[PDB]
Write a protein that binds this ligand. Structure first.
Ligand SMILES: CCCCCCCC/C=C\CCCCCCCC(=O)OC[C@H](COP(=O)(O)OCC[N+](C)(C)C)OC(=O)CCCCCCC/C=C\CCCCCCCC
Ligand SMILES: CCCCCCCC/C=C\CCCCCCCC(=O)OC[C@H](COP(=O)(O)OCC[N+](C)(C)C)OC(=O)CCCCCCC/C=C\CCCCCCCC
Ligand SMILES: CCCCCCCC/C=C\CCCCCCCC(=O)OC[C@H](COP(=O)(O)OCC[N+](C)(C)C)OC(=O)CCCCCCC/C=C\CCCCCCCC
Ligand SMILES: CCCCCCCC/C=C\CCCCCCCC(=O)OC[C@H](COP(=O)(O)OCC[N+](C)(C)C)OC(=O)CCCCCCC/C=C\CCCCCCCC
Ligand SMILES: CCCCCCCC/C=C\CCCCCCCC(=O)OC[C@H](COP(=O)(O)OCC[N+](C)(C)C)OC(=O)CCCCCCC/C=C\CCCCCCCC
Ligand SMILES: CCCCCCCC/C=C\CCCCCCCC(=O)OC[C@H](COP(=O)(O)OCC[N+](C)(C)C)OC(=O)CCCCCCC/C=C\CCCCCCCC
Ligand SMILES: CCCCCCCCCCCCCCCCCC(=O)OC[C@H](COP(=O)(O)OC[C@H](N)C(=O)O)OC(=O)CCCCCCCCCCCCCCCCC
Ligand SMILES: CCCCCCCCCCCCCCCCCCOC[C@@H](O)COP(=O)(O)OCC[N+](C)(C)C
Ligand SMILES: CCCCCCCCCCCCCCCCCCOC[C@@H](O)COP(=O)(O)OCC[N+](C)(C)C
Ligand SMILES: CCCCCCCCCCCCCCCCCCOC[C@@H](O)COP(=O)(O)OCC[N+](C)(C)C
Ligand SMILES: CCCCCCCCCCCCCCCCCCOC[C@@H](O)COP(=O)(O)OCC[N+](C)(C)C
Ligand SMILES: CCCCCCCCCCCCCCCCCCOC[C@@H](O)COP(=O)(O)OCC[N+](C)(C)C
Ligand SMILES: CCCCCCCCCCCCCCCCCCOC[C@@H](O)COP(=O)(O)OCC[N+](C)(C)C
Ligand SMILES: *[C@@H]1O[C@H](CO)[C@@H](O[C@@H]2O[C@H](CO)[C@@H](O)[C@H](O)[C@H]2NC(C)=O)[C@H](O)[C@H]1NC(C)=O
Ligand SMILES: COc1cc(NC(=O)c2ccc(-c3ccc(Cl)cc3)o2)cc(OC)c1
Length: 1100
């Protein structure tokens, strides 16, 4: 076995060699002699595509190793790729890797479709928004070469970016003395644009993955107008929502297919050994009370309060120690230390005694939260927490290999990134650094920050760091590295998620008037009238905006209308009372809701007729009018079905919600132990701009008091902090949703002891807190959540006899009919024309060569539209227009050729009539541009842009060729009807929350997420923000201004205002508004995914 020893030591030293990742170059050359030593032996002894590569690696390493006058650090890459030998060494990873390539082989159809949609939407965005991202708010001149004194801009408040502008009515206006001019450079670093097919394709690829897409949304709306939100509604839905669902499906059957194929002491000991059950109940109560005590500490604790916590902690620790000692003297330590749980209990308690021994205030705070680990002891009676434990265990058990390969991928990518881009970050660190700072917060100088960049990429935030690296280094390596990490890591993480999901979870006179009233209430016209009344009453709410006071007549109009509606609904309730009868009416679960709404309306009306309309309880019931639209769900059956589906799934959601609250309680208690009271800073607030005061001045809260000479210093705190367990839940929500977590991370790593100014990255290893939090509390908790939703949905489906929920019976028959549509293969080829002349065109067009050459011509035209760019030339546009005329002539010729041969059967097939619409639309666009160009009325140039959108139909003609694309879009159009009902529910919720925001949040300071275009002063502005946060994008930015409660941010003393007497939004209402909305929207989107994915299986 000496040969075995030889091979098992050389691979070990080789793997250890690259684990040397640190910067110092103290000992690297000695390893070359071992390389040469092991190289010689293998060939002389003379006793796979990868193995051939392996032979080559030793030769190329020897070539690299001979004379090293110049090093570009490339030589390191060949040895970092040597590490992948260990992948083949362990038996497990081989089959898992083979399965991974297998999923990629089946991703081919989705990839083609995704690229096609991205190209189509990139072309649309290029046509519509070319050069829009070049406008800026430019100072005008007092008084003349082509270039005056350079164009001085204005910064958007709270940022260093120049202000964006537009000449449109709903685009965005500069302040007094500024004009909207098209500048020469683009917003971010001149990389975010629609000025070319490449830039637009990058922007649409960013949109598809929703990585900071809110910035693009706001910029293009600020530069083009609010009406262009229809673009993002289409892109987010079609691009993001669908193609990810296609990926999620394809990974499912690909993976699912793989596993489917496969003396005195004795009497005392005996008494101790026998234990009453009522002995463990006390254990449970002490555990619960101990966690309740630990969840009660905060920042401003009184000395008696901390004393209470200390005495409680000592009482509990000794009690568990007593339980331990009794239990060891009950059994024998041989049999006692066999059980899987008792050893856990022992290690936990002993750590607590060790801490009692070494008790310093701040000594191992993380280990202080080690006694939180006994909360999992309540798993023998809580089945769901037990399933969570089994999930976490399967993550390193039956599915250890996937975690191992994920770790290898992260390690290799981080190390290669360091070796390649490391120096470039440090030397050119000055352009990627913050205005007042000296380093970027995310770089690759050392291994740890490189790993952080890779982890953040895996979390879905890759494009900003890509901009930074492209600014600091060489663009090519940046593209390759960031895109490869994104795709490969996301693939591996998604595969791991699905793998965990599958195996774990799935292993007289009054009587006659009563009768007539019953006739009235069930008459169809009455129902239609009532529905119309609900629609009008709901729509009238969308007019009580910020400017309603400035409009005097419509205010009284809405007054009289709401009075007549509330009288109408009182009358309607009386008819239902007199017809249906009291007992049934109060046992309906819908009439109860309508009755409550009309109660609120009536109380508000009487209290307003009376002079009690400003007392707060009535003023708070006036805000509850936003619930009026909740009367529609009982009317339209689709929303009724969707609501029933949600209610049927609510109970299990409650259980898993409790489990996640417990787990996040553990993490939040740890966070309070680590961070509480440490996020306070001092800022130089002058006018909408603050700057972290340098440590050369204060370093203290006391000094911030003395150096308050200019009256601009403020000892403020981070708005979402870790001072309580409740605030800790908000912080964990922001971190797990990946929105707003940046500021939390920054304040955490900058933290120090209490009452001193934060210092740059003084706690760089507190990043590990958030890494662990994501890995466990986000990943596995979402795993458990999704698993229970899937199981519950399966239960609902079987309960109704295996049918499809979310669909009305009319939509059901539509479903069966359109399914029958998709499977009718034969068509009885049309007759052959008798006339020789009529015949000639028939047998020339019917042959496949004509179709093929027309497809090639369509691809050529797509290429000709790909080369369009902003600010190209006069000549380029002239030639491109001539070629466009050539193509439109060719396609009108093909249309007239087919139409004359196929006389009546031409329109029978849908693709030919669709082609007819495309060609007639192209002719119409051409002639319309010709007439409406400067020869006649000169409307805005933006009209030309939308007219020239008619050529995209020629590109969409290619869908007829791709069979896989034609089947996936078939799956879409079959899944559409259920998505209609779910979207109706989502729109209803969005409307209700829009009304709530338009009443609750319209007087706030313009800040991070709220400005003159995205605020709650108007129904359109509210709907923009609510659509933006439907995907949770940037909800931190809108919540931030509402959390404000005074100076220096808000002004609580504003005479002009009638609400809070200032800006000073309401934090309590603010939290409930946004936090609830994201969960409901998330809960809805899961059902939408489930609706989409099941249709995919039936297609397959
Ligand atoms: C931080 C949050 C981490 C939580 C980890 C779970 C805590 C321990 C749970 C005890 C489970 C147990 O009771 O243990 C044997 C189990 C019980 O199951 P039973 O059938 O006996 O009942 O056996 C089984 O069934 C399978 C359950 C075994 C649990 C696998 C342990 C995986 C933990 C990995 C730690 C991750 C590193 C953390 C680094 C952050 C610092
Ligand atoms: C309720 C409780 C509150 C907290 C829980 C909420 C948890 C949220 C987790 C966010 C993930 C959900 C977002 C799905 C849609 C999305 O956001 O899509 C991004 C995904 C990856 O999602 P992720 O990075 O967030 O993980 O991108 C991709 O997978 C596409 C990968 C690119 C492949 C393209 C191949 C074609 C070339
Ligand atoms: C196949 C890919 C072909 C890509 C298009 C040709 C390459 C190209 O991009 O160069 C065409 C020139 C560009 O000139 P420019 O106005 O962009 O000036 C430069 C910009 N600036 C104003 C700042 C100085 O245009 C010209 O000279 C006239 C040529 C215009 C026709 C271009 C190719 C059309 C054929 C497409 C395939 C069928
Ligand atoms: C793209 C946007 C929207 C398109 C949505 C189309 C949804 C409906 C299509 C599916 C359908 O329900 O099909 C209905 C039937 C299919 O029967 P079949 O002939 O296949 O049966 C074969 C048996 N046999 C031949 C003997 C009769 O009849 C048909 O195909 C008639 C289908 C006519 C569809 C015209 C859609 C035109 C709408 C928009 C065009 C936009 C172009 C410009 C875009 C600018 C950028 C935004
Ligand atoms: C928040 C959200 C707000 C609202 C957002 C808007 C939602 C828009 C939603 C959807 C729009 C597109 C959905 C319809 C797509 C229709 C494609 C289509 O219906 O074709 C497929 C059929 C298949 O037939 P098969 O024989 O292959 O059977 C397939 C064999 N099996 C049974 C195995 C599958 O073909 C046929 O029925 C031939 C007859 C039809 C001929 C004209 C139909 C095509 C016209 C336009 C399609 C363009 C779609 C563009 C999508 C976006 C691209 C960027
Ligand atoms: C789920 C719901 C959990 C219920 C949690 C509610 C407890 C918080 C009570 C609260 O603290 O409310 C105060 C809010 C403003 O919040 P604040 O932080 O300024 O409170 C101090 C106000 N001080 C400085 C202005 C005078 O005053 C207000 O107008 C509204 C009062 C709170 C509104 C409760 C929302 C209804 C709850 C559930 C419905 C779903
Ligand atoms: C696991 C799966 C996901 C779970 C997600 C849970 C998210 C819950 C967030 C709860 C946040 C509670 C919270 O932040 O309290 C704190 C707020 C802050 O108010 P303040 O006036 O500025 O005082 C600040 C001072 N530091 C103080 O609190 O002293 O104090 C308040 O005034 C707010 C009080 C009411 C907050 C109620 C939140 C209900 C959210 C409902 C979520 C579930 C919806 C379904
Ligand atoms: C490398 C991954 C880059 C992703 C982005 C670039 O896409 C490359 C391929 O996915 C293109 O399409 P396919 O090769 O999947 O088409 C499959 C059908 N044939 C070609 C096999 C017949
Ligand atoms: C299978 C069964 C499992 C079910 C488990 C359910 C059991 C739930 C039991 C919950 C128990 C609740 C315990 C709560 C403890 C009481 C809550 C603890 O109260 C302590 C505070 O009120 C003391 O406040 P101070 O008055 O000291 O305030 C400061 C003092 N100065 C500074 C003003 C002078
Ligand atoms: C579906 C049921 C829920 C929604 C019930 C129907 O809501 C329709 C509203 O969105 C109609 O638009 P608005 O009345 O909001 O638009 C007018 C806006 N300004 C111009 C007066 C401000
Ligand atoms: C027990 C040992 C556990 C070791 C790690 C076991 C495997 O867990 C690693 C995954 O959580 C990595 O995924 P990420 O956290 O990078 O992705 C972000 C989470 N989302 C995107 C899915 C929400
Ligand atoms: C990036 C550039 C895009 C790569 C473009 C890759 O094109 C290859 C696909 O068309 C694969 O289709 P096949 O010809 O292999 O067979 C499939 C049969 N149908 C579905 C086409 C009818
Ligand atoms: C969010 C996603 C939005 C997708 C929005 C999808 O919109 C497509 C709907 O127009 C298709 O609806 P149907 O043709 O099924 O209409 C049948 C329903 N009624 C009208 C008969 C009741
Ligand atoms: C520095 O001085 C300014 C003004 O002298 C202080 O600003 C006051 O802040 C308090 C609340 O902390 C408000 O009630 C006052 O209305 C503010 N005054 C003015 C004029 O704006 C600020 O608090 C001081 N900062 C520190 C750290 O001492
Ligand atoms: C039905 O509502 C929709 C959802 C989406 N989905 C997304 O884009 C997305 C990504 C991540 C999250 C997301 C993550 C966490 C929480 Cl708590 C909430 C949401 O949503 C898309 C839609 O198209 C209109 C509609």
């Amino acid at each position: 076995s000496w040969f075995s020893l030889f091979i098992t030591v050389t691979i070990l030293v080789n793997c250890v060699c690259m684990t040397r990742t640190d910067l110092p170059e103290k000992i690297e050359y000695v390893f070359t002699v071992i390389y040469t030593f092991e190289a010689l032996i293998k060939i002389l002894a003379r006793g796979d595509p990868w193995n051939w590569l392996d032979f080559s690696v030793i030769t190329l390493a020897y070539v690299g190793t001979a004379i090293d006058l110049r090093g570009i650090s490339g030589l390191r890459t060949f040895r970092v790729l040597r590490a992948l030998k260990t992948v083949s060494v362990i038996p497990g990873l081989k089959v898992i890797v083979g399965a991974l390539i297998h999923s990629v082989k089946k991703l081919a159809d989705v990839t083609i479709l995704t690229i096609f949609c991205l190209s189509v939407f990139a072309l649309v965005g290029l046509q519509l928004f070319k050069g829009n991202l070049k406008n800026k708010c430019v100072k005008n001149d007092m008084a003349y070469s082509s270039h005056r004194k350079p164009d001085i801009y204005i910064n958007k408040r709270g940022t260093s970016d120049p202000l964006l502008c537009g000449n449109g009515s709903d685009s965005g206006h500069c302040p007094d003395g500024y004009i909207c001019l098209k500048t020469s450079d683009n917003p971010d670093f001149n990389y975010t644009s629609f000025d070319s097919f490449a830039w637009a394709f990058l922007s649409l690829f960013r949109l598809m993955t929703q990585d900071s897409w809110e910035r693009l949304y706001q910029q293009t709306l600020r530069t083009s107008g609010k009406i262009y939100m229809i673009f993002f509604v289409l892109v987010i839905f079609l691009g993001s929502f669908y193609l990810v669902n296609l990926i999620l499906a394809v990974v499912t059957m690909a993976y699912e297919e793989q596993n489917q194929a496969t003396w005195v002491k004795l009497k005392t000991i005996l008494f101790g050994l026998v234990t009453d059950p009522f002995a463990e109940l006390t254990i449970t109560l002490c555990i619960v009370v101990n966690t309740i005590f630990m969840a009660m500490e905060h920042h401003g604790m009184s000395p008696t309060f901390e004393a209470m916590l200390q005495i409680g902690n000592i009482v509990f620790t000794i009690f568990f120690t007593a339980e331990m000692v009794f239990k060891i003297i009950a059994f024998d330590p041989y049999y006692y230390f066999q059980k899987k749980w008792n050893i856990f209990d022992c290690i936990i308690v002993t750590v607590s005694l060790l801490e009692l021994g070494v008790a310093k205030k701040g000594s191992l705070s993380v280990l202080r939260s080690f006694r939180l680990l006994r909360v999992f002891k309540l798993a023998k009676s809580w089945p769901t927490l037990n399933t969570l434990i089994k999930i976490i265990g399967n993550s390193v058990g039956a599915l250890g290999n996937l975690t191992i390969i994920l770790a290898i991928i992260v390690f290799v990518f981080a190390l290669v990134g360091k070796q390649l881009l490391g120096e470039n970050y440090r030397n050119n660190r000055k352009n990627i650094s913050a205005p007042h700072e000296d380093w970027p917060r995310w770089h690759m100088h050392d291994f740890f920050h490189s790993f952080l960049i890779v982890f953040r990429i895996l979390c879905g935030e890759w494009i900003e760091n890509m901009w930074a690296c492209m600014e600091v280094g060489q663009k090519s390596i940046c593209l390759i590295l960031f895109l490869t990490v994104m795709v490969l890591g996301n693939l591996v993480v998604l595969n791991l998620f699905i793998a965990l999901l599958l195996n774990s979870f799935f292993a007289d006179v009054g009587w006659q008037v009563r009768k007539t009233c019953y006739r009235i209430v069930e008459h169809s016209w009455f129902e239609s009238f009532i529905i119309f009344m609900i629609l009008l009453s709901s729509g009238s709410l969308a007019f009580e905006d910020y400017y309603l006071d400035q409009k005097p007549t419509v205010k009284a109009l809405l007054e009289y209308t709401d009075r007549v509606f509330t009288f109408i609904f009182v009358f309607e309730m009386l008819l239902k009372w007199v017809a249906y009868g009291f007992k049934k009416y109060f046992t309906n679960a819908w009439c109860w809701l309508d009755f409550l709404i009309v109660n609120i309306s009536l109380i508000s009306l009487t209290a307003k007729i009376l002079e009690y309309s400003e007392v707060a309880p009535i003023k708070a019931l006036r805000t509850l009018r936003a619930l009026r639209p909740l009367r529609a769900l009982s009317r339209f059956e689709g929303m009724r079905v969707v609501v029933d589906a949600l209610v049927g799934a609510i109970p299990s959601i409650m259980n898993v919600l409790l489990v996640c609250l417990i787990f996040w309680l553990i993490f939040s208690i740890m966070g309070v132990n680590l961070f509480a009271g440490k996020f306070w800073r001092c800022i130089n607030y002058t006018d909408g701009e603050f700057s972290l005061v340098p440590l050369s001045i204060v370093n203290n809260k006391s000094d911030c008091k003395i150096q308050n000479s200019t009256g601009s210093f403020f000892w403020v705190n981070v708005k979402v902090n870790f001072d309580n367990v409740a605030m800790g839940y908000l912080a964990l929500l922001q971190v797990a949703t990946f929105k707003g977590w940046m500021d939390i991370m920054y304040a955490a790593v900058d933290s120090r002891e209490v009452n001193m100014q934060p210092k740059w990255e003084d706690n760089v290893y507190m990043y590990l807190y958030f890494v662990i939090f994501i890995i466990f509390g986000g990943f596995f908790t979402l795993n458990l959540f999704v698993g229970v939703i899937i199981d519950n949905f399966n239960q609902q489906k079987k309960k109704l006899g295996g049918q499809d929920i979310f669909m009305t019976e009319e939509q059901k028959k539509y479903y069966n009919a359109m399914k029958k549509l998709g499977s009718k293969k034969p068509q009885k080829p049309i007759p052959r024309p008798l006339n020789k002349f009529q015949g000639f065109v028939f047998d020339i067009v019917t042959r496949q060569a004509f179709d093929i050459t027309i497809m090639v011509l369509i691809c050529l035209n797509m290429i000709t539209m790909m080369v369009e760019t902003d600010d190209q030339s006069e000549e380029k546009t002239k030639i491109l227009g001539k070629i466009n005329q050539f193509f439109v002539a060719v396609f009108t010729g093909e249309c007239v050729m087919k139409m004359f041969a196929l006389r009546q059967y031409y329109f029978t097939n849908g693709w030919n009539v669709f082609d007819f619409i495309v060609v007639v639309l192209s002719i119409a666009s051409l002639i319309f541009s010709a007439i409406l160009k400067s020869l006649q009325s000169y409307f805005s140039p933006t009209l030309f842009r939308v007219i020239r959108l008619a050529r995209i139909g020629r590109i969409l003609r290619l869908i007829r060729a791709a069979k896989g694309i034609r089947t996936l879009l078939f799956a879409l159009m079959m899944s559409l009807p259920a998505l209609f009902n779910i979207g109706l529910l989502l729109f209803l919720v969005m409307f209700i929350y829009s009304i709530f925001g338009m009443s609750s949040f319209p007087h706030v300071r313009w800040e991070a997420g709220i400005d003159d275009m995205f605020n709650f002063q108007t129904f359109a502005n509210s709907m923009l923000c609510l659509f933006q946060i439907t995907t949770s994008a940037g909800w931190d930015g809108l919540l931030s201004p509402i959390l404000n409660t005074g100076p220096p941010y808000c002004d609580p003393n504003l005479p002009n205002s009638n609400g809070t007497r200032g800006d000073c939004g309401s934090p309590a209402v603010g939290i409930i508004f946004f936090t609830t909305y994201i969960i409901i929207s998330f809960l809805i989107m899961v059902n939408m995914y489930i609706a989409v994915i099941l249709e995919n299986f039936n297609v397959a």
